[PDB]
Design a binder for this molecule. Structure first.
Ligand code: ARG
Ligand code: MG
Lengths: 304, 307
């Protein structure tokens, strides 16, 4: 709520240079060796950005350049053309804002990027909301957001100020209840065998969705409450806040079309609903608090 | 030392497993991480009941039953021995398991006679028991050879069934690396705790040798690892000890699968000297593990002679 008059939030362009990939489910097995390394043995990779998400269609992978080098090319692997940069928002301090804050940046970030034809990919995590943009759009990004945000670019691990350089998609709601969880990285070994089983060895009203990310040492997991029961239940949160999913799109969305996240986040913000938002290679996914799910579906139906 | 009835016979069990013997080149191991993780750690997901992986300087040798073999994609990196192998195990009269590290205790009764009849063997000693692999087509010669001293049973749907009248060259060089080896087991329910360090050791990268063995056969785990590799683990690897083992590597060039008498010319002299041994055959070479303090005596005994 209350803030000083002259004050501006901060937009951080992080160091990461990210490739976005799809691995066909039948080929996943081929990538077990490099993925296990990136998940469980980061003492052996220079990777600092790793996102893996299971959908019905594929496994989408978002990996920094160092992580990308570990992946052998194959006909099972589709690679998005562009290299992507990672945006994050924080308060004037450089202090993290609440998670599930995608709707809080609908008007200030998401709609203005779409208005300037800047395609985004979202990656909400337990800790924060990341927005990925292609390299090519960076100058338009700065143009778009310098008015309201103090923009900082990560150069040698430090935040540095920049100056000049530096249509309506169908929705589904499956019935799964989702948890958004974290875990101490020191606890990863104890969970490793059941995590490997879930990710690598697993065969309309329900959807298969499982998200695991390790970003700068921070672990984020989204899983089915049913899938949670497979683990010791020594995964962390503050709660049982369970979440319901809305999946966005009819056919595969590209990396070119703008305004998708804007259609979802704008109406949801106008209704004061929180959301995590996760983009995969083909589709978008919003996670809204379970008790507000009918109201979400209502609000989204109102867009023309 | 014990006593038994004069007219009693130890039992020879031909187990249910049908085994394939494979070599994976070190540069291609990564391709096999998915099915091997499954066979090691998620045995519920496969019908495999016999799995053995040993790392050497040359390769990774895999011994697996037909059901595990199914899970392994062909590639340039994978060599398969032609034959299907059957698995023999000795027990006492009345079906009881025999002490481990007992290759020398069967040198005279099993090993020498099989070599005398040109039955080529592969040895797999584990923490639990000594397995002797023979090719399927030799089975009737095996029976002829061992029927005299042993009551022979074929395992059929997990039950031992008595067998009736056949029923359903060169002296090799030796080197002992300086490595000290332990033979370990694990409670299967504690594999998860160890999974990432074990994965890291297997899948992620002369006076000493690289040798590591892991087997999971009928729910039982067996591991052989270097004393220094042991330091990378939480120290609930179970043994009876500080009795470490020294390795004698046997052969000067790859030994293949046809030559008989190799295990015999090693286990024979050691039985005469009353020194105990584990014995493990890999795709290229044979390996005896002997008590560390007896190594000089072993080398002595072995240089005296004229798989
Ligand atoms: N492959 C995708 N997930 N595409 C949709 C992502 C969001 C879209 N680029 C936008 O700017 O609104
Ligand atoms: Mg004879």
């Amino acid at each position: 709520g209350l803030v000083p008059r002259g004050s501006h939030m901060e937009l951080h362009i992080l160091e990461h240079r990210v490739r976005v990939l799809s691995v066909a489910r039948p080929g996943l097995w081929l990538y077990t060796h490099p993925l296990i390394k990136l998940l469980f043995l980061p003492r052996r990779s220079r990777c600092k950005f790793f996102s893996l998400t299971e959908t019905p269609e594929d496994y989408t992978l978002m990996v920094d350049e160092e992580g990308f080098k570990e992946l052998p090319p194959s006909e099972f692997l589709q690679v998005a053309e562009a290299t992507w940069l990672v945006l994050n928002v924080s308060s004037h301090s450089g202090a993290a804002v609440q998670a599930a804050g995608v709707t809080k940046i609908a008007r200030s970030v998401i709609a203005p990027l779409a208005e300037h034809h800047v395609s985004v990919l979202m990656l909400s995590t337990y800790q924060t909301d990341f927005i990925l943009v292609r390299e090519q759009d960076l100058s338009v990004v700065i143009h778009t957001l310098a008015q309201e945000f103090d923009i900082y670019r990560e150069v040698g691990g430090e935040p540095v100020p920049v100056t000049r350089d530096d249509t309506v998609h169908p929705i589904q709601s499956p019935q799964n209840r989702f948890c958004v969880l974290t875990l101490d990285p020191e606890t990863l070994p104890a969970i490793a065998t059941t995590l490997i089983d879930v990710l690598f060895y697993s065969h309309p009203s329900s959807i298969t969705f499982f998200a695991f990310s390790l970003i700068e040492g921070y672990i984020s997991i989204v899983m089915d409450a049913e899938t949670q029961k497979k683990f010791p239940s020594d995964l962390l949160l503050t709660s049982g806040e369970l979440w319901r999913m809305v999946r966005i799109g009819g056919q595969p969305l590209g990396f070119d079309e703008c305004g998708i996240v804007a259609q979802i986040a704008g109406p949801l913000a106008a209704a004061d609903i929180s959301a995590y938002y996760i983009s995969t290679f083909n589709f978008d996914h919003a996670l809204v608090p379970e008790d507000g799910i009918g109201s979400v579906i209502e609000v989204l139906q109102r867009r023309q």
